[PDB]
Structures are given as structure tokens and as C-alpha cells.
Ligand binder design. Structure first.
Ligand SMILES: Nc1ncnc2c1ncn2[C@@H]1O[C@H](COP(=O)(O)OP(=O)(O)OP(=O)(O)O)[C@@H](O)[C@H]1O
Ligand SMILES: Nc1ncnc2c1ncn2[C@@H]1O[C@H](COP(=O)(O)OP(=O)(O)OP(=O)(O)O)[C@@H](O)[C@H]1O
Ligand SMILES: C[C@@H](OP(=O)(O)O)[C@H](NC(=O)/C=C\CCCCSSCCS(=O)(=O)O)C(=O)O
Ligand SMILES: [Mg+2]
Ligand SMILES: [Mg+2]
Ligand SMILES: [Zn+2]
Lengths: 25, 259, 109, 50, 521, 442
């Protein structure tokens, strides 16, 4: 559904972006 | 009936100890760690797979007829036959929300079929794996009983309950199971409770502010609430000591008149 | 919202669904968001609330134009929501504002 | 007299069986060699990784 | 003679009629098959007969007619009624009404054997030989008889390659065979088998069936067997009942009932062809060795070469104990391999797996979801909690309920069933409603690579094709990679396209599912 | 009479048996059943004929991993075992109207010999039973099979085993419930030698009967050690009555009230019952509430706390269905009670100390063994005078087969021998009957 996709893009806390200390360099 | 008090004293430390001992007191929750994340930090089983068994289900096995033994309702983990596992915590002497003997007393007052052990810098509770995970997530990790900075789920090497905190206010860890992420201000568990690294670090929230720690701690301190400020606890301790002495000398109603 | 410096603050719409309108958060000031003003009964309409550190989406602000007995203005349960304020006079503009648009607020104490 | 006094013989088959079945840990000749290294370091006065 | 009656019994669970108007009669020796849909009430009826707690009838009652020793304490079969017993007093005939009429229940309940569904009743840490030895010493035989008996039983269940192997370290069907061997070695008056074959391959299923025929019927013991796999019912019993949603649709001979059953099934869908895009996994010399000082080397994996390709349903067919679960766990980065290389292609780089860490295996493990063969839920939680809060959904709690309902519907539940199931515990579901709930739990996080270890095994052809179409639709509309371990051939023909054959830790060859089928036969 | 205490006796099913029974009717010095059990324990010896045959056939004389080449005797003890029993009975026989019970166990591979009381009336200790049985067995074996004069030493080593050099029976095939008096923890400690597993196996895993057996043995030992003399006799009698024999049905009542409860709920029910019965009263109310409690009856309060301790152990170990919780349950039951009421715990902290001993004895690498091998004749568990051991029997009865030191592994022969006696298999019922038989003499 459009609503489910909207939640997926709006509330996706990607680990690499949030926790760059661990998943990056 | 009998309405139970739980602890003597009028200070905030005594009130917090009473709250921990009270089974009807709803502990304030301060974080949300998913069940699978708690299982991953625990490090006993892989989340999503079934629990290993030690004996067949209680219905399959045959026991002799025992009226008194059958009066007690068993745990679900016992009903299925799960292995007994443990969860261990180390608490800092610097205003950790929960303390070893307080933890053991609250566990034995609030949970069914648990095995609690108390050390100076250690506290472990053992139970059937499913129920152990249930009350580890519900009570031990999500509530005010846990602070990711001053307390830590850790087996194997436990040391730092009496040492000073590090630059971020975190308890000393020789294995560094949990690290402080300054970008987000959150504590992340990079290893499970025994020391093998985790594939994905798990966010256990951010450290509790020290002002709240002063209010929710259960330890007596000169810098915080001192026992001299709580003469009621000292009087009860002295009464227990004198009652023990009189009972060990001659256990009669006449010798207890000097109580 | 910026009311510490100016007299008019700005709230950005972050997510919207029927009765709910959630505002953007600042992941720099949402640190000591201990549960402070948690609802005891059903939340009434036009109540501004911020989700505390209990929930995963800590710091997000939101408001709903209706009342429910289970969820706060941000889709979280009552133990994860602390009430900060309410909308007093001007309404029926939260239902006609798209996502990403900024609405402006004025404190009336 | 010293050599006789300081000798104790301990059988390690119940320990291996308990490790394999109850404790859920595999026992291999490599693990036995590792245990022998550990006990040789620790028996006289040693303290492992401490 | 007549063994047990079943009067007009109606089991209710809060105005939810799980069973109603179920009535049948069984005598000293006869096999009866209980045939029905998934969730019809077969397991409820079997636990009803076994006497498990919480399965007490609400309307009717069941009667057990058996012999009894009024001092020495043994029930026996109603045939031994009128036989000077080994102790003194002989065998009084007792018509034991279950859930009433105590003082016989404990002894009678000892003499009834049940094969639980998906649950293994074994001691785990006590090997294979000691489990059967304990079962024998529990009741009957003696320390010569027990010995030879145990040897011949492990012959029947064909576990001579795992004699001293710790039964906790066994693998699925092997544990089920251990449980069956233990359940025979108790001389029961009735044998309640709930999916006795389980999710076993046809060869081992035939082996277990021969073991059952030799063991129970030869000793004139009644069996109540549920498979909902028509062929097993037809080849084992003479009388059978067919119940739907707790109502007896047909009562008669096994042949006629089973024939009636295959008329009410729907054919498979045969989804359209979908092309793949690039290679995604690569396994070169993966090997898993379980070395012990007391049992030798168990080479679960012996140098398997695999390669997967994006939007593809990959199959892993083989015999029980081949090493399918080990390979699947190696794919999911759950079990490290003893040797070999394993590479995953996130976007354009190949992360070297078999190395722990977020810079490494944890990179790809975020998009890898596996449904284990021995799955589990959180029984202390509701279904909604299991879908949303137990794993951590990325959305506020208010919008998680609708996402959970949508995932349940996509799994193959109707809207009413999904709505009613949300505020329920896994203990209140059926094995095959729990399996779909676990599949939904895997699917709701939407990973890139999905491993399904035996998705079927307790599901009807209708439910199985629902699961098949769900997988196909997800693969088509979400470019999800799938790796399937299964034993149902037609599932592999219609779902998979590049299945592989596993035999003793080897890959033999890889090809189309029809090619693998004609290689097998 | 000197004690005005009255008790009502309940059976293991919670049914009333008798009311207003004098407290001394269950005393070890008055109860006929306790006397009979003590005498039977003293005079009963178990012989392992199969063990003797195996040791002699392989020359396995000498202990752990010991074996003497060339000193092997090939005799059929299990095949004969009626002949040997008859000869042993004839040798041990003193008179015609004489006990001298020798009975065949497991079809010839074991013997259960009861030495006559005449040989024990002129003995200063109980060790005469094992020595007389060993001598009679040696003579019977030498006479039945014509053993050469130069192999009697081998026969002796097979039967007794290293005794002149090692002052005990280590590698022998003859055993008794009581150990050597020279190997006691203290003076009068002979009766605290039966482990928990032996008590559980003898009673066939019956919770109340195992509790009664352990409590009877422990309190009779306290009477023997001189502890239950003068002012302590009342406290030990009340402890026995309320912890072992389920006086006033307190244990069953607490278990029923806390079927779904925890240790804290058991503590609450115990305090409520003590308040309702007048056992404890309010001492004073402090400034911060917490009305302190003082015992109106010190010994009765100790008995109530002991009964509640047993009930708490039963509740926790029936919830977990595991016997590993005993130490923590006792320790923290006492802790919670003390800091809940301001009252002393069971045995004035000795129960808590013994629980700490249990904890460090069964929960670490410096731990050793499990709770099934607990007995009062150990340095770790001797500190409580019969108040911490009986709950371990309930804990091990509630165990669902998750212990390495299970009763089946360690006490099979003991159960097979001592389960034949009615007073040992059901100590609770027969102790109650014996107390009923002497109700009117007080
Ligand atoms: N404790 C319970 N409370 C309520 N409903 C229950 C309970 N146990 C089972 N049910 C319901 O009863 C129905 C039959 O369940 P059962 O386990 O007997 O199914 P089944 O015929 O064996 O099917 P399956 O092939 O899925 O194992 C299902 O709808 C299930 O949800
Ligand atoms: N932890 C372990 N230690 C030792 N051997 C093991 C262990 N786990 C599995 N095995 C053995 O390795 C072999 C492969 O097991 P695996 O689970 O991969 O088989 P499978 O083909 O999936 O079986 P099934 O079809 O019965 O589910 C089996 O013989 C099993 O007993
Ligand atoms: C009787 C014996 O106890 P045991 O019978 O349980 O071995 C008794 N104590 C022992 O347990 C044995 C040795 C002393 C070890 C104590 C070291 S204190 S430092 C370790 C603390 S922790 O391991 O509990 O965390 C002794 O021999 O002195
Ligand atoms: Mg079923
Ligand atoms: Mg498998
Ligand atoms: Zn009989």
C-alpha cells in the first residue's frame, strides 16, 4: 500500500546513518 | 489480612528499596529494547530458533502421585522442559539504580522459580530460559532497575563496581561490552554478556542523568543520602542483631524481655 | 521551535495521517527527555505532546484533532508520551497543511 | 619423599563427559592440549590473563 | 474387544467451537486415521484423548474400557481382563470415564502414549541409547529384554549411525525417530500419533510407517493417527473419520473417506516465469565438521559449492540428515563454517563473510531473514506483540497493528482470521497457524535474502499453495531472494527453478526441479 | 507434663488426624516410632553380593583403580545367595526368638541383614553391626566355597577393604547408613549422616514423607548432641512438629495459599498467620511507619518461620521444577522476613548461614556436588541444628530430573533396602500413629 511505503521511507532508522561509529570506518 | 510494609526508613534510598521490593509497584520504564535484542545480548540462544530442552515435557514424563507437590503450578518453561540459563548484572557503587542485595531481594519477592545469587560486585539470577527472557526484557532491562552507564549486563569478567566512572559516566569494563556513541549520545552493546562480539550492536538507550540517579538509587552514600540521615534503618538492623544474639544465648520469653 | 530567541516559533510537518499531524524533531536537544507529564486519562483533542526517551522515536512532536483513550498525539502509548502544551485558539489549519510545510506558533500563556 | 608427597593422579573422563553432554561443549584433542597448556601455566603459581 | 468410546463431545474455548459432535468407537486392535483441514481440531482431539490439562470436555465425555490390578497397580489392555496377574488379585474390568472416575487415571494415563506435534519428548543430553533404555526401564521388559529391545528398536528407526550421539545435537527427523522409538517402548494400550511422520522425506516416512506397522498392530494396540496427508492415512488404517472445523463431515471406511478428501482440494497456481539479475551469493569450499573425542567426526558439510541469483527461489532437497539445515544456517551467517569462503554482494562489493563484526557479516545480516526448522515464538506475548514489539518494527505503535494485519493477510489469512488472531497467544493457535505466524514474523521486516527451512510439513495442500503463492508474489513485487529447504516435490517443481540435491554433505548436481526429480527417480 | 503446648496432627494429604495432641508425644524420647527407626538404622547392614563376586573375579581388591594380579577368586555368590544368607544368619544368630533378619534383594545380588539387638545392647556404639556382618560373611564365604587358607585375606579385602590400614570401608561391598564414629564432624553427630538423596529414595520421592524423615533424623540428632536440653528442648520439639510433621497443617496451608505465588508472598502469608495466631505482636511504630514486631512466643515464632521456610522452598522449586533453588530460597526468605518484620529468621541466622554454605557448595567451581548430597555431618552444613536440611528434601522431591546427583544415581541400593520398612517408607504416617499411641500418658 501507499501508506505502508510512506511509513517505510519516513520511519526507517538505517543503522549506518544513525551509528556511523560502528558501521562506517 | 496483613498489609506488608517492605523496608524501614524515611529517606529516598529506603523508599526506592521499598519500591523494588513491592510487587504491586509498577517500575517506571525508561527504554524500549526489543525481545530479540535482549536475547542477543544474553547470548545463550539464537533468536528465532526453538528453546533447547533438558527433559521431556512434564506431561510426557511420569511422576509418582504427590498431593503436596502438585499443589504448586509450574512455570511454562518447566512445563515444556527448557534448560536453566542465567542473566548477570554488575552495579556501580556510584548511585546505580539497583544494588546486589536489593536486586536479589526484589527478584525473590517478584519472580517465581528464580535462583538469585549475590556477590559484592556481581548479581546473577537463574531461571528457565523462556521465563528468564520474559522477565529480563520486561523488568530487568526496560525499567528503572537498569542504567546503561552505571550498570551492565555482564558475565565472565566483572570488575569496576568499586572503581570510579570513566569520562562518560560509564562503569569500568575490562572487556568493553558496551561503548558510548557520542554522535547520538546512546550506549551500544558491541558484545554479549560473556564477551563474544555481536554482529550488529544493539542500542540500549542513553545514560540516565545523574540528577535522576540520585533520586532512584538504592545505595547509601556520604555524598548522597547517608545512613546517619536514616536512623530508622540502623535501629532495625540493631534490633535484628540483638534478637539474634538473645535467641542464640537462651531462646526463652524471659531472655527476650531485654530486647 | 525557536521560541527561546524569537516570539514566533516554527513547526515543520513531518508525517500526517487523517487526525494525526507529527512535527519534526531536533536530534540535538532531545537528551534529558525523561517521562515528565504522562497522561493518566484519555487525551483530549488539541494537545501537543513529545515522545520521551522510552520510545524509539524520542523527541518527535505531534498533535491530533480528536481524542482516544489508548494512543497519544504521536502514535505511542501514554507511558511514552509527555504532554508539553495545547493549542488554544486557532485550529482547522492542521487539516489543510501538507507534509514538509511549516506552521507558525505564538505563545499565549 | 618430596616427589611422592607432591603427586596426585586425577582421572579426566567424567569431566569430559560432563563437558560434552551437560555443558554442551565439544571435547577434542586440540582442546585437551589447550587445557594441558593452561594447567601447566597455572599449577605452579600462575594466574591466567590476570 | 471394545477399547474406548467417544460420546457426543463438543469442546469450546469461549464460544469458539473447536470441536462439536465428534463421536467414534475403537476396539482392542485397529488403526483409525483422523483426517481434516489445518486447524480442524485433530491436535485438540488427540490431547483430549491423552488427558492433557485444559482439554476437558464441555458437553460430552469419553470412556476407557481396560483391565486393572486393584493392588499391584497396572491397567493393561481389556484383553488381559480375566488373567491371573503376576501379583495377587487378577485383572478386574474397569470402564474408566476420563475426566471423572479417578484412582485409575494415573495408572491408565501411564499406559497411553502420545507423539506430540513438532515437540520432541526426549532428554536431550542423554544420547540416543540411554533415552530408549530409560523408556524401557520406565515400564516393562528388563535389563536383558530392554537391551535387545533397544537394539532392535534403533534398527527399526534406523539410527545405528547415531547410537552414542547426544540426542540434543540431533537433527529434526532424527529426534522425531528417537521420540517414536521411546514411545513404542512403553507397551501402551493406545498409541496417539500426531503427524508421526512429520516433515520427513518419503523414504524415512516409509521407514517410520513400517516401524509403526510392525510395532503397534502386531501387539494388537489401537492407534489414533492424524496426518492430513491422505496417502499415509490410507496406507495405515482401515477406518477413518473426516472432520472439518470441528464437525465430522464423513465417517466410514478409510478408502472412501480419503477418496472424498482428495475431491475437495484445489490445484496449484503455476506462477509466471520471472528472470533473475546477477549472482548474489557464492560459496566455494564450505565445510562443517563436528569433531568429538567420544564419537568421531560428523561431517555435516563436505565442500559444497553453491551460487544464487537475486530474484530466484532456490531449492535444497535431500534425505534426512543430509545437511540441509546446516547449509541453511551457514547461509544465514548463523553457524560459521569450519572451512571455505562465503561472499555476499550488497550492491557491488563482496563482503567477506565468516568474519564477525558490523564492518563484515553484520552488514549483510541486516537483510537476511531465516525461518528455522524448529521455529519458536514468544509464548508470553500476543500475536500482535510477536509481529511488532518482539522484533522492533520501524514505525509508531499505532500504525504497527495495520502493518501486522496486512502481513498476516499476505501470509494467507483472511481479514476476519487476521483480526481475530492478533489478540491471541501462540499457545492458543495450531501448529500450522503458528508456522504461518512465524513466516509472517520473518517477512514483516522485509529482508533481501530469505531462507525458509521447511515452510510446509504441517499444512494442507490448500495452505501449502497459499504459502507458495505468497512467496511467489513477494518475490515478484519485492525482488526478494529465496532459499527453500523442503521435502514436498510438487512445491519444488512449482515454486523453485534451480533446486539442488543434498546427499551426505554433498551437492551432487544442480538444475531445474524437474531435472532433480528425474535424477532422484 | 511440663509443656502445655498442644498440636493437631495432619496427614500428607492435609486431612486432620487428631487434635490437642501433647507436644511431647512426638518427642524422640517418647515416640515409639522414632525409637524403632533409630534402632533399625543402627542394626541394618546392606551387602553387595554382586560387588563381592565382581571384585573377587577380577582381583579388584584395594580401592580406586587398585587391582592385585594373582589374587583372584572365582566364586558364585549371586548363584548361591540363599546358602550364604542362611550361613550368615546362623552365625549372627544369638537366640531362637531373635531378630537376625537376612533377606535376599534383587534376586540374589544384594543382602539386607539386620543384626540382632542382643549384640547391640552390649556395644558402646553402632559399629558392631557392620563388623559382625563382615565377619559372618567372611566365615560363610570361606565355608560355602572351600577357600584355601591363603586366600582369606583376599576375601576380607573384597568384603571390608583396606580397613586395618584405612580406618573405614572404602573399597568394600558392605555399607550402612551411619559412618564411622571416628569420622564425625563433632560429638553426637552420628545421626546427621543420612544425605537428602537417601531420604528421598527411601520415601519414594514423596515430599511430605521425605521432609518428615529428614526432620526426624535431624532433631533426634540434636537431642543426641545435647543441644535440645533444658531451655532448647521446647524450641527443637516445636521445630520438629511444625517443620517435619506438618503440625496445624501450616506447610500445606502456606503451599495452597501460594500456589501461584513467590517467596515474598510466602513470607507475607507466614507473617499474616503469625499475627492471626498471636505468635507475634507489634513492638512499636517508628517515625517512618514500619511498626516493629516482637515475638509473643519466641519458640513458636521460630517454628512458624521454619514451616514457612519449607513452604517457600516447596513453592519455588515446584514453580521451577528444579532443585537448584534451595540455597537462594532459604537465604532470601530469611532476609526478606527479617527486614520486613524486624524479627529474627529461622534459627536466629543459622539457617541463613547454612543457606550461604549451600550456595557456595553447589553453585560454583569451588562448589562441590549438588543439593542431593547435603547432610548435617559436613563442615559446610552443620551450622543449623536441624532447620535447613528438611527443606532440601522437598526441593529434591520437586526436581524434574535436571540434577546430576539425582536420587536414582546415588541411592538406588539404599532405597531398595530401606523402602521395605514401613516406618522408613512413610515416616510421617507412622510417626503420627506412634504419637497417637502415647497421647494419654502425658
Ligand atoms: N487453547 C486454545 N484456545 C482457543 N483456541 C484454541 C486453543 N487450542 C487450539 N485452538 C484452536 O482450535 C483449532 C484447532 O487447533 P488444532 O491444534 O487442534 O488443529 P489441527 O486440526 O491439529 O491442525 P494443524 O494441522 O494446524 O496442526 C484452531 O482454530 C486453534 O486456533
Ligand atoms: N551440534 C551438532 N553436533 C554434532 N552433530 C550435529 C550437530 N547438529 C547437527 N548434527 C548432525 O549433523 C548432521 C546434519 O544435520 P542437519 O540438521 O544439517 O540435517 P538435515 O538434512 O537438515 O536433517 P533433517 O531433514 O532431519 O531436518 C546430522 O547427522 C545431525 O545429527
Ligand atoms: C569447604 C570448602 O567449600 P566447598 O566444599 O564448597 O569446596 C571451603 N571453601 C571453598 O569453596 C573452597 C575454597 C575457597 C575459595 C574461596 C575463594 S574467594 S574469591 C572467589 C569469589 S567467586 O568465585 O565466588 O566469585 C574451603 O575449602 O575452605
Ligand atoms: Mg495439529
Ligand atoms: Mg533439518
Ligand atoms: Zn497385578
Amino acid at each position: 500500500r501507499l501508506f505502508l511505503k510512506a511509513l517505510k521511507e519516513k520511519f526507517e532508522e538505517d543503522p549506518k546513518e544513525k551509528y556511523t561509529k560502528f558501521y562506517t570506518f | 489480612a496483613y498489609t506488608p510494609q517492605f523496608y524501614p526508613g524515611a529517606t529516598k534510598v529506603a523508599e526506592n528499596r521499598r519500591n523494588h521490593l513491592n510487587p504491586n509497584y509498577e517500575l517506571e520504564k525508561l527504554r524500549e529494547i526489543p525481545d530479540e535484542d535482549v536475547v542477543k545480548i544474553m547470548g545463550h540462544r539464537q533468536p528465532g530458533e526453538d528453546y533447547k530442552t533438558v527433559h521431556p515435557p512434564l506431561e510426557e514424563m511420569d511422576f509418582v502421585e504427590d498431593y503436596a507437590r502438585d499443589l504448586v503450578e509450574p512455570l511454562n518453561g518447566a512445563k515444556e522442559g527448557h534448560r536453566v540459563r542465567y542473566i548477570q548484572f554488575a552495579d556501580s557503587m556510584y548511585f546505580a539504580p539497583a544494588q546486589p542485595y536489593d536486586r536479589s531481594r526484589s527478584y525473590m519477592s517478584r519472580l517465581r522459580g528464580v535462583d538469585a545469587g549475590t556477590l559484592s560486585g556481581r548479581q546473577v539470577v537463574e531461571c528457565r530460559e523462556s521465563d528468564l527472557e520474559e522477565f529480563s526484557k520486561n523488568i530487568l532491562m526496560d525499567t528503572e532497575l537498569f542504567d546503561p552507564a552505571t550498570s551492565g549486563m555482564r558475565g565472565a569478567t566483572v570488575h569496576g563496581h568499586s572503581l570510579r566512572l570513566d569520562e562518560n559516566g560509564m562503569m569500568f569494563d575490562a572487556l568493553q561490552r558496551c561503548v558510548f556513541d557520542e554522535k547520538t549520545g546512546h550506549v551500544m552493546y558491541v558484545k554479549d554478556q560473556v564477551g563474544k562480539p555481536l554482529d550488529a550492536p544493539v542500542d540500549v538507550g542513553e545514560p540516565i542523568p545523574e540528577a535522576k540517579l540520585r533520586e532512584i538509587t538504592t545505595i547509601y552514600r556520604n555524598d548522597g543520602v547517608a545512613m546517619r540521615a536514616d536512623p530508622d534503618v540502623i535501629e532495625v538492623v540493631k534490633r535484628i542483631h540483638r534478637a539474634r544474639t538473645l535467641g542464640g544465648y537462651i531462646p526463652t520469653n524471659e531472655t527476650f524481655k531485654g530486647l | 521551535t525557536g521560541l527561546t530567541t524569537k516570539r514566533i516559533g516554527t513547526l515543520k510537518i513531518y508525517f500526517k495521517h487523517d487526525d494525526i499531524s507529527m512535527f519534526e524533531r531536533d536530534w540535538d536537544y532531545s537528551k534529558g527527555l525523561l517521562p515528565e507529564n504522562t497522561p493518566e486519562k484519555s487525551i483530549d483533542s488539541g494537545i501537543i505532546a513529545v515522545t520521551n526517551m522510552v520510545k524509539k522515536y524520542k523527541g518527535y512532536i505531534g498533535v491530533r484533532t480528536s481524542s482516544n483513550d489508548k494512543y497519544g498525539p504521536t502514535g505511542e502509548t501514554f507511558e511514552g508520551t509527555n504532554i508539553v502544551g495545547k493549542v488554544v485558539k486557532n485550529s482547522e489549519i492542521l487539516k489543510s497543511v501538507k507534509q514538509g510545510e511549516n506552521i507558525y506558533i505564538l505563545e499565549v500563556n | 619423599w618430596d616427589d611422592i608427597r607432591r603427586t596426585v593422579i586425577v582421572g579426566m573422563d567424567t569431566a569430559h563427559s560432563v563437558l560434552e553432554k551437560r555443558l554442551g561443549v565439544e571435547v577434542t584433542p586440540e582442546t585437551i592440549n589447550e587445557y594441558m597448556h593452561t594447567i601447566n601455566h597455572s599449577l605452579p603459581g600462575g594466574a591466567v590473563v590476570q | 474387544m471394545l477399547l474406548l468410546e467417544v460420546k457426543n463431545v463438543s469442546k469450546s474455548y469461549g464460544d469458539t467451537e473447536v470441536l462439536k459432535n465428534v463421536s467414534f468407537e475403537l476396539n482392542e486392535g485397529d488403526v483409525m486415521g483422523v483426517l481434516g483441514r489445518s486447524g480442524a481440531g485433530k491436535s485438540v482431539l488427540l490431547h483430549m484423548l491423552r488427558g492433557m490439562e485444559g482439554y476437558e470436555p464441555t458437553s460430552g465425555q469419553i470412556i476407557y474400557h481396560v483391565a486393572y490390578c486393584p493392588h499391584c497397580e497396572n491397567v493393561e489392555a481389556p484383553s488381559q481382563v480375566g488373567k491371573k496377574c503376576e501379583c495377587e488379585t487378577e485383572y478386574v474390568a474397569k470402564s474408566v470415564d476420563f475426566w471423572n472416575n479417578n484412582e485409575i487415571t494415573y495408572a491408565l494415563k501411564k499406559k497411553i502414549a502420545i507423539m506430540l506435534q513438532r515437540t520432541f519428548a526426549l532428554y536431550g543430553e542423554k544420547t540416543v541409547a540411554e533415552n530408549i533404555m530409560e523408556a524401557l526401564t520406565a515400564a516393562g521388559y528388563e535389563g536383558k529384554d530392554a537391551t535387545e529391545w533397544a537394539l532392535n528398536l534403533i534398527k527399526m528407526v534406523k539410527l545405528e549411525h547415531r547410537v552414542a550421539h547426544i540426542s540434543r545435537d540431533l537433527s529434526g527427523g532424527e529426534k522425531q525417530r528417537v521420540v517414536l522409538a521411546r514411545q513404542i517402548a512403553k507397551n501402551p494400550v493406545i498409541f496417539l500419533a500426531d503427524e508421526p511422520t512429520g516433515t520427513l522425506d518419503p523414504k524415512t516416512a516409509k521407514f517410520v510407517h513400517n516401524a509403526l506397522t510392525e510395532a503397534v498392530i502386531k501387539h494388537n494396540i489401537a492407534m489414533v493417527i492424524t496426518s492430513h496427508w491422505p496417502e499415509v492415512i490410507e496406507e495405515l488404517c482401515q477406518k477413518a473419520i473426516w472432520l472439518d472445523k470441528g464437525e465430522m463431515r464423513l465417517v466410514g471406511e478409510s478408502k472412501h473417506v480419503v477418496e472424498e478428501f482428495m475431491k475437495t482440494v484445489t490445484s496449484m497456481k503455476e506462477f509466471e516465469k520471472v528472470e533473475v539479475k546477477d549472482e548474489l551469493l557464492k560459496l566455494e569450499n564450505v565445510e562443517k565438521r563436528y569433531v568429538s573425542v567420544d564419537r568421531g567426526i560428523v561431517k555435516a558439510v563436505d565442500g559444497i559449492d553453491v551460487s544464487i541469483n537475486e530474484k530466484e527461489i532456490f531449492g535444497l532437497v535431500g534425505v534426512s540428515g543430509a545437511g540441509k539445515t546446516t547449509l541453511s544456517k551457514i547461509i544465514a551467517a548463523v553457524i560459521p563454517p569450519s572451512k571455505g569462503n562465503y561472499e555476499f554482494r550488497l550492491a557491488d562489493e563482496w563482503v567477506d563473510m565468516t568474519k564477525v563484526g558490523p564492518l563484515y557479516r553484520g552488514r549483510a545480516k541486516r537483510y537476511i531473514g531465516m525461518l528455522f526448522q524448529e521455529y519458536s515464538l514468544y509464548p508470553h506475548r500476543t500475536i500482535l506483540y510477536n509481529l511488532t514489539e518482539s522484533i522492533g518494527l520501524e514505525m509508531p505503535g499505532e500504525f504497527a497493528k495495520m502493518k501486522a494485519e496486512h502481513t498476516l493477510v499476505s501470509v494467507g489469512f483472511t481479514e476476519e482470521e487476521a483480526e481475530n488472531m492478533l489478540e491471541k497467544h501462540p499457545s492458543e493457535l495450531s501448529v500450522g497457524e503458528k508456522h504461518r505466524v512465524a513466516l509472517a514474523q520473518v517477512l514483516i521486516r522485509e529482508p533481501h535474502l530469505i531462507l525458509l527451512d521447511e515452510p510446509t510439513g504441517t499444512m494442507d495442500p490448500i495452505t501449502r499453495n497459499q504459502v507458495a503463492e505468497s512467496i511467489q508474489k513477494s518475490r515478484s513485487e519485492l525482488d526478494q531472494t529465496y532459499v527453500i529447504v523442503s521435502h514436498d516435490m510438487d512445491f519444488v517443481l512449482n515454486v523453485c527453478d534451480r533446486a539442488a540435491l543434498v546427499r551426505g554433505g554433498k551437492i551432487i548436481k544442480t538444475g531445474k526441479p524437474d531435472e532433480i526429480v528425474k535424477i532422484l527417480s | 507434663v511440663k509443656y502445655e503446648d498442644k498440636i493437631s496432627l495432619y496427614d500428607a494429604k492435609g486431612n486432620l488426624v487428631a487434635e490437642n495432641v501433647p507436644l511431647e508425644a512426638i518427642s524422640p524420647l517418647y515416640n515409639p516410632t522414632i525409637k524403632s527407626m533409630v534402632k533399625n538404622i543402627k542394626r541394618t547392614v546392606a551387602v553387595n553380593l554382586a560387588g563381592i563376586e565382581g571384585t573377587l573375579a577380577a582381583g579388584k581388591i584395594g580401592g580406586k583403580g587398585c587391582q592385585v594380579p594373582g589374587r583372584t577368586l572365582d566364586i558364585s555368590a549371586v548363584s548361591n545367595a540363599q546358602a550364604i544368607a542362611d550361613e550368615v544368619e546362623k552365625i549372627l544368630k544369638v537366640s531362637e526368638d531373635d531378630d537376625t533378619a537376612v533377606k535376599i534383594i534383587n534376586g540374589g545380588k544384594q543382602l539386607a541383614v539386620q543384626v540382632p539387638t542382643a549384640r547391640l545392647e552390649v556395644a558402646a556404639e553402632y559399629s558392631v553391626s557392620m563388623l559382625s556382618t563382615a565377619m559372618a560373611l567372611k566365615e560363610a564365604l570361606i565355608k560355602t566355597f572351600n577357600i584355601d587358607m591363603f586366600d582369606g585375606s583376599t576375601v576380607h579385602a573384597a568384603i571390608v577393604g583396606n580397613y586395618p590400614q584405612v580406618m573405614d570401608y572404602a573399597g568394600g561391598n558392605i555399607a550402612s547408613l551411619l559412618g564411622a564414629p571416628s569420622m564425625m564432624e563433632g560429638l553426637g553427630y552420628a545421626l546427621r549422616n543420612i544425605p537428602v538423596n537417601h531420604a528421598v529414595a527411601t520415601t519414594k520421592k514423596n515430599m511430605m514423607n521425605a521432609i518428615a524423615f529428614s526432620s526426624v533424623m535431624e532433631q533426634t540428632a540434636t537431642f543426641e548432641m545435647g543441644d535440645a536440653v533444658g531451655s532448647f528442648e521446647r524450641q527443637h520439639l516445636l521445630g520438629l512438629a511444625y517443620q517435619g510433621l506438618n503440625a496445624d497443617n501450616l506447610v500445606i496451608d502456606f503451599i495452597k495459599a501460594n500456589a501461584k505465588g513467590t517467596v515474598g508472598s510466602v513470607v507475607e502469608t507466614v507473617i499474616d498467620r503469625a499475627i492471626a495466631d498471636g505468635v507475634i505482636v507489634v513492638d512499636k511504630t517508628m517515625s517512618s511507619g514500619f511498626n516493629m514486631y516482637k515475638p509473643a512466643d519466641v519458640n513458636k515464632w521460630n517454628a512458624y518461620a521454619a514451616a514457612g521456610l519449607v513452604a517457600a522452598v516447596a513453592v519455588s522449586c515446584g514453580a521451577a521444577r528444579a532443585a537448584q533453588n534451595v540455597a537462594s530460597v532459604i537465604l532470601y526468605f530469611n532476609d526478606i522476613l527479617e527486614y520486613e518484620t524486624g524479627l529474627p529468621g529461622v534459627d536466629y541466622g543459622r539457617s541463613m548461614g547454612t543457606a550461604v554454605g549451600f550456595s557456595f557448595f553447589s553453585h560454583s567451581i569451588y562448589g562441590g556436588g549438588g543439593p542431593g548430597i547435603f547432610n548435617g555431618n559436613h563442615v559446610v552444613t552443620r551450622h543449623s541444628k536441624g532447620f535447613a536440611i528438611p527443606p532440601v528434601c522437598a526441593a529434591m522431591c520437586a526436581d524434574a530430573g535436571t540434577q546430576m546427583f539425582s536420587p536414582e544415581h546415588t541411592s538406588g541400593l539404599v532405597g531398595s533396602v530401606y523402602s521395605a520398612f514401613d516406618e522408613f517408607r512413610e515416616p510421617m504416617k507412622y510417626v503420627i500413629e506412634g504419637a497417637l499411641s502415647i497421647k494419654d500418658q502425658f
